[PDB]
Design a protein around this nucleic acid. Structure first.
Length: 64
RNA sequence: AUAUAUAUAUAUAUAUAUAUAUAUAUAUAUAUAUAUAUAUAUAUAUAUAUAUAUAUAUAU
């Protein structure tokens, strides 16, 4: 058995040295990885919800 | 009173020296241009701190 936590509030509550593994990192990306990752993080986000106008569980529409 | 010779002064010519203007060479200062270096400001990236917003927790 394993447990997964909820993100919402619910209703009820030998020479093994291989001859190729040596690291020689001489390469810098163009564009750099760090820069592009930051940019993708922003477009990655889903667009915001628009609750206004809709009713609530009580029955009254929310908004101003 | 006259002539020749001699001395001083004025004028002219030749030689030597000085000052001003002009020309050539050398040096310095200012300006412009180029190059290098430094500093400052602006922009980009990384790290730290502060503030604000969202999520979570605590308090009212």
């Amino acid at each position: 058995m394993k447990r997964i936590p909820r993100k919402t509030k619910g209703k009820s509550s030998p020479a093994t040295t291989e001859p190729g593994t040596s690291n020689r990192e001489q390469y810098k990306a163009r564009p750099g990885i760090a820069s592009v990752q930051r940019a993708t993080e922003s477009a990655e986000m889903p667009m915001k919800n628009n609750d206004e106008g809709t009713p609530d569980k009580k029955g009254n529409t929310k908004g101003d």
